[PDB]
Write a protein that binds this ligand. Structure first.
Ligand SMILES: Cc1ncc(C[n+]2csc(CCOP(=O)(O)OP(=O)(O)O)c2C)c(N)n1
Ligand SMILES: Cc1ncc(C[n+]2csc(CCOP(=O)(O)OP(=O)(O)O)c2C)c(N)n1
Ligand SMILES: [Ca+2]
Ligand SMILES: [Mg+2]
Ligand SMILES: [Mg+2]
Lengths: 844, 845
């Protein structure tokens, strides 16, 4: 019959658009626009057709032939009840068929054991009960209450029980304020008495400068039917979405260490607010990384706490441009399960389906938990002033605990005395103040401490013969591989440096430093835009065959039993990428983790990660991060965005030994700088002003002797054979400007002015600067020289450090570019005239 | 008839997935994976069925019944040739039927007039010819050549010709490096000789410190069959996608000024690279704004220069997580037209469809121009070292101009002599150096210069009876409107302030300042998270009815003929939002344009806009931007992210009078500060350290007399009746710390130490500070006091300004928080101890 074809189009119409008419809002507040396609009359089916049997076809109901009365009911139960599945936009036929099997076979309605139902009720009770307790015990205090979205707690425990049920070993969570204290107490097993002690202010005992209670992270073991599973909740700042990239980098470092090439042992989970996930662009930057080979973690389960309001903003036309906040997920074709949070069984049922999807297909999946915010944005705020109707409806809306208990009683699946005792047993458990999570376990088996002082001794030396054999292996590539003539010219030059015929350039000394690290079995993860070859054609860590596209990585082939070596050409992001590498370095300190800006000027698109994480995470959260940032830097006439890494900004952020700001000027210096970062037992961030023109400067060279038997020099004394008595002025400087100073002093045959580099600006190396200055007893004045404008660079932030170094009688003077609004002139002509001007002011 | 249902599923398979098998790559380089659904056998159609006639259904070919062999030919011609249409993900049925009509009715192959074909050939000729000329005249110089994507120039001229053809009046373009120099010369009408002089370095005659040649913008009139259309190409920095939000704010200010409610008179256009559009999150932030009220511009035409490489990265698994760089567009259900760039008629056909779609449905549309990059990422780079196979293929790939010329000749629509002469006539036109755009026209009639010095006089005073009458109208609301009792309590307090019963609070003086600005007919646009009510429950510019949802905006109801007033609750973005307000303010200087951070700590997620636009756009591009940034600031024990607007960073960025950094401490000061921003003839950015606790501080109050008859004070002298001779120490300070200093000095019964506010830190008000210091001839030492840690705040950047101020005998000292990695402690208890310590260190002598 033609009607059998019409039944088939109706079935797909619900699969495409049934979620648009689904009962997803707990409050029932605003009606959904009608969709004609969901009505059989749109397909010319009438009541006479409704009594006739039909064939389901692809509808996976488990009965080949059905009356239309049950087919129409099955479609509404599957696609228009509590669950709104948005998945047909996906192009993979196997994945869409897979989701149809999960939903359509059960006809939407899920089945759980009565013990499973009693667990969801107790988990709702713990969520509501902890929040009503804090509002009584600490009225008015800022706790970002979960109330109205209490199903997030049973959804989360069901995720973790389901992770161990399918063999996952670790779960890493990154989230925001909403439900944060409920997570700490009711899933991660933080003791309630310790939460009560923080509200009273009696928590103490640290020189961590600290952070507010709803930014804290936690760790615990958590019993699951598959056994104990490690749990980790990240620290995060107030900035709303940026923790998500950091958690992605942590789990990748975990998956890399464990040899989990399919991310099936470590489950990442991120929790988002509905307004934050739509407005913040780092969400899309992270979705773009979800399958990038250098950042993929096997897929993330993403849960949105969609309380249909963001602070005081509730109009959909003010927050976003689409019907759902989750539509950003369609960029990577993620299935999206909207679910009513007043239907806990639907929440757990969609939660298992979402996890099963992520593990079957190793792809991101999103759970839209549609709910409400019972109170104001925080408990001191009045929501009626801006959402009067939403809170007149919430004020007469019963809690999800009460609602679910009413359903189990109607179905004779529970009795009211059991539901009542859970409310009171939980309140008594909070009064005792001990852990209230049944499933919590003490962690099973942390040293070595990596907070040691920057001037701690380290093994700078390396075997000179081992260093040359490493260099020879780097120059070797398969004979069949054919290099571009410029790359083989470069490896031919590296072959001469290994023979002693030519002093090493910057790239060889950098490559050698990586080689000694993997030679000792330590990991190297490099990341950046065009980091394999290098923006300035200097690295060439990856060699591409000129016949086929095949690559060969000499640093990955040094010897068997080497530490792993990876260098990824990153995606066009700096915010999410630098946050990813921050989470990688903190989770796995032992190796070298290095991010490379293509120019240091672009690093400011990750300014939140620099401000709220790198420079401040130790004082705030006791986190040590060894991440190294290569920021190309130097004034060469290329204009405002290709001159300044904003060195002045990193120096301004320096305090309390939080960071290292280094400006190497020699290939040997960058070699020792990189090894000290791994070799020295300190893991604090290394901000590097990477050279550009110095990669090929003829005077910027170092012998093999300088690497094997040298050390990193925080300050470098005068190098030419000046007589110390003859000096009348000492010029402090950093970076390439020294090389312009040196050649001009030699061209003048000037021996009355010494030049002293300060390779490490923070922490300031006091005695190394004084030691370089000591021989010049006749000195009368000192000069700070810099290519950079005076309102930028090291001048404003490092004046007191230089002044403390110099003898008391002498005064210090400035020589450099004038202060300016823009980092650099746009014209090359004006730049060279400025360069000659400042170089002459310093030497006269 | 069972095969008839199978034919319909085959037709929809191509509508859904034909683009996966389309020939989109000019190079033919990498084969695409088979989609099973596109071949009939998958649907049990065999050759015997191919001879039978079938019903096309909704297939819009213009014939209801067709043999299957010709339905299959029509489907491959429509969805598997040069055009790859991705639109079935959209949920609006009408928009899908609209696209099917355009595409299926021409059966893939579209028809153009012979003049239109000769125009696309000449426009391809100018695109190739200009770049080969620059490579000949200036070998090795960095010009980001369009070559391989030459189809872009005819596509752009067809976008503009079709805009005026349908009555649009302005077109505003924002783009990147790729094809930038070709855009200026061959679309915008920049003189080639001025471009050649910039390559030679002979450009001069400006105090703009300037920028590189491929960041410059341009303006022109452009003849179209419907008449002249204004053209505007934005200045942009090197940061790749950030210009896009700025262009959205520029056309929105244009649509607002023109009374264009639906943006049908001003067309926004954005051009993107394949790697940047996938990696940068500001792209998704702007897509989220496309239908937000208060940022919607009626839809943007977005063009991707998809040359399948970004610098040295060409592997898809390293650049993105999806098959197409454009898949982010699906977040807003934008249709996406992939098109092979070696088929200019396909490019022009899809370009007309994209504009017609954007004007019919006022929604974003994307044109994916699939092409190649003929040279390296720039002309000094070697691309073979990292993409050997792509450049062995490009090295033997003929240019789009030659390829199109071969097609017009093979079809006898053109002759080889006509195509040859275009190549040579164009090279001669470039040698002469005059404008080469035939459609270019001189602009028709920019004089109230707004770069005047910050100390320029302005009309600070306002009539006091009008100021009180403005306040009475602000307190009036409709009888049917019902306020929440806290809001009615607040307007009753404002009703008391208008009568003189009570001094004005911070919110009343701020609202009053807005009222005087709209009262004189000037525009006010405020934007920021929860900016309607205010994060701190102080503004309440929008009044929500407690019975229905209706709003009432008292500032929009001052009197008829007032300037428009708008206050928008922004999206949860700061980067794309602050870039949008930068483009609004720069395009429309005359009014007040204000962005409000929810806390000043959150502005650093828009740090690129602050660095590359706000702090540097005047020296780089001669752009005046009057935008005001409200950044809440102040140490109150709320922690590292709720204390510091990073004042030290803005002070570090101050040079060459680029910005204003102000810390008002009185309700009257913010009133005069806001009016000075519009009433004074200067349009430079205003960075404001907004108070938090001062909004309710009993001592932070001002009389109506201070607003009507006062003025903004860059520095505020001692307010208490101290005798100058008895003073022994002067304490400089700004912001709320003054009130902690003042209240402590009164509790101590101390008359030996004066306290002087410095409301404007940059540009530094020298003589006003010296004037405040003059009476204290007996002073022995000076102190800068600040809540901030010593490495933050004003200490490092303003030391020389204070030291040059003080009398020669005296020396300057510091009193404030110790330097720290974090902006603020996480514990309230600790906060107080530090506050009492620094306040006591300043007052003890
Ligand atoms: C990056 C960033 N910008 C601004 C803020 C200030 N802020 C904190 S919470 C909030 C609203 C959050 O709305 P939503 O995402 O829906 O989360 P909810 O609290 O409603 O659960 C805003 C704008 C922030 N914390 N982070
Ligand atoms: C925000 C930002 N990050 C980094 C850079 C440095 N950069 C300039 S061009 C480029 C590659 C651009 O690739 P694509 O988007 O495809 O544009 P194309 O030049 O190939 O057309 C990079 C990483 C930049 N200009 N802006
Ligand atoms: Ca961003
Ligand atoms: Mg919310
Ligand atoms: Mg590209």
């Amino acid at each position: 019959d033609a009607k059998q074809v019409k039944v088939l189009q109706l079935i797909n119409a619900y699969r495409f658009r049934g979620h648009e008419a689904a009962e997803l809002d707990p409050l029932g507040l605003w009606q959904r626009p009608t969709v004609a396609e969901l009505d059989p009359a749109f397909h010319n089916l009438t009541e006479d057709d409704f009594e006739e049997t039909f064939n389901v076809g692809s509808f996976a109901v488990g009965q080949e032939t059905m009356p239309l009365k049950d087919i129409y009911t099955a479609l509404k139960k599957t696609y228009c009840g509590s669950i709104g599945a948005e998945y047909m936009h996906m192009t993979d036929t196997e994945q869409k068929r897979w989701i149809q099997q999960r939903l359509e076979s059960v006809v939407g309605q899920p089945s759980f054991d009565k013990d499973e139902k009693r667990t969801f009720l107790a988990e709702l009770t713990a969520a509501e009960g902890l929040e009503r307790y804090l509002g009584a015990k600490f009225p008015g205090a800022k706790r970002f209450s979960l109330e109205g979205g209490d199903a997030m707690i049973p959804m989360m425990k069901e995720l973790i029980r389901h992770a161990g049920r399918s063999g996952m070993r670790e779960v890493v969570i990154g989230m925001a304020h909403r439900g944060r204290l409920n997570m700490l107490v009711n899933v991660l097993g933080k003791k309630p008495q310790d939460l009560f002690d923080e509200f009273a202010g009696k928590h103490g005992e640290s020189w961590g400068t600290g952070d507010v209670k709803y930014h804290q992270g936690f760790s615990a073991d958590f019993a699951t039917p598959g056994g104990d599973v490690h749990l980790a909740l990240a620290f995060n700042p107030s900035h709303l979405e940026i923790v998500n990239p950091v958690v992605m980098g942590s789990v990748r470092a975990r998956q890399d260490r464990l040899g989990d090439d399919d991310g099936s042992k470590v489950l990442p989970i991120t929790i988002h607010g509905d307004s934050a996930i739509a407005g913040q662009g780092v969400v899309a930057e992270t979705f773009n990384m979800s399958q990038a080979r250098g950042f993929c973690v096997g897929g993330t389960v993403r849960v949105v706490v969609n309380n249909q309001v963001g602070f005081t903003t509730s109009n959909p036309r003010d927050t976003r441009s689409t019907m759902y906040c989750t539509d950003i997920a369609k960029m990577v074709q993620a299935p999206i399960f909207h679910v009513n949070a007043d239907d806990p069984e639907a929440v757990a049922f969609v939660t298992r389906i979402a996890l099963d999807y992520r593990n079957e297909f190793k792809r991101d999946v999103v759970i839209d938990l549609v709910c409400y915010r019972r109170h104001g944005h925080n408990e001191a705020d009045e929501p009626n002033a801006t959402q009067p109707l939403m809170y007149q409806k919430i004020k007469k809306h019963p809690t999800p605990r009460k609602l679910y208990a009413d359903v189990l009683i109607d179905r004779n699946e529970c009795d009211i005395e059991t539901a009542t005792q859970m409310v009171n047993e939980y309140r008594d458990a909070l009064d005792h103040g001990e852990v209230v999570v049944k499933e919590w376990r003490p962690m099973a088996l942390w040293s070595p401490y990596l907070g040691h002082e920057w001037d701690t001794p380290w093994s700078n030396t390396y075997d000179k013969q081992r260093l040359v054999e490493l260099g020879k292996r780097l120059c070797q590539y398969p004979e069949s591989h054919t290099l571009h003539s410029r790359v083989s010219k470069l490896y031919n030059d590296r072959t001469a440096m290994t023979n002693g015929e030519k002093e090493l350039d910057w790239g060889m000394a950098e490559t050698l430093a990586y080689a000694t690290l993997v030679d000792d079995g330590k990991r190297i993860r490099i990341s950046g835009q065009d980091s394999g070859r290098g923006t300035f054609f200097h690295r060439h860590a990856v060699l591409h065959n000129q016949n086929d596209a095949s690559t060969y990585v000499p640093l990955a082939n040094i010897h068997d039993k080497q530490g792993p070596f990876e260098v990824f050409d990153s995606v066009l992001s700096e915010e999410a990428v630098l946050a990813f590498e921050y989470g990688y370095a903190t989770a796995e300190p032992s190796g070298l983790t290095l991010w490379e800006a293509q120019f240091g000027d672009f690093a400011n698109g990750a300014q939140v990660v620099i401000d709220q994480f790198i420079s401040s995470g130790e004082q705030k959260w006791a986190r040590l991060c060894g991440l190294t940032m290569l920021l190309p830097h130097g004034y060469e006439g290329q204009g405002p965005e290709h001159s300044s890494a904003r060195l002045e900004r990193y120096l301004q952020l320096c305090a309390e030994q939080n960071m290292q700001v280094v400006v190497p000027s020699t290939p040997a210096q960058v070699y020792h700088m990189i090894r000290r970062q791994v070799v020295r037992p300190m893991r604090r961030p290394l901000i590097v002003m990477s050279p550009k023109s110095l990669l090929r400067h003829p005077l910027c060279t170092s012998s093999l002797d300088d690497l094997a038997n040298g050390t990193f020099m925080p300050a470098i004394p005068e190098i030419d054979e000046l007589d110390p008595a003859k000096v009348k002025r000492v010029v402090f400087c950093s970076g390439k400007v020294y090389f312009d100073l040196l050649e001009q002093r030699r061209n003048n045959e000037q021996d009355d002015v010494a030049i002293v580099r300060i390779e490490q600006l923070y922490p300031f190396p006091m005695d190394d600067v004084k030691a370089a200055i000591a021989p010049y007893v006749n000195v009368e004045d000192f000069v700070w020289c810099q290519e950079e404008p005076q309102n930028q660079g090291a001048w404003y932030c490092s004046q007191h450090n230089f002044r403390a170094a110099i003898p008391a009688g002498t005064e210090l003077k400035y020589a450099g570019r004038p202060a300016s609004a823009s980092p650099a002139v746009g014209y090359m002509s004006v730049h060279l005239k400025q360069q000659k001007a400042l170089i002459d002011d310093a030497l006269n």
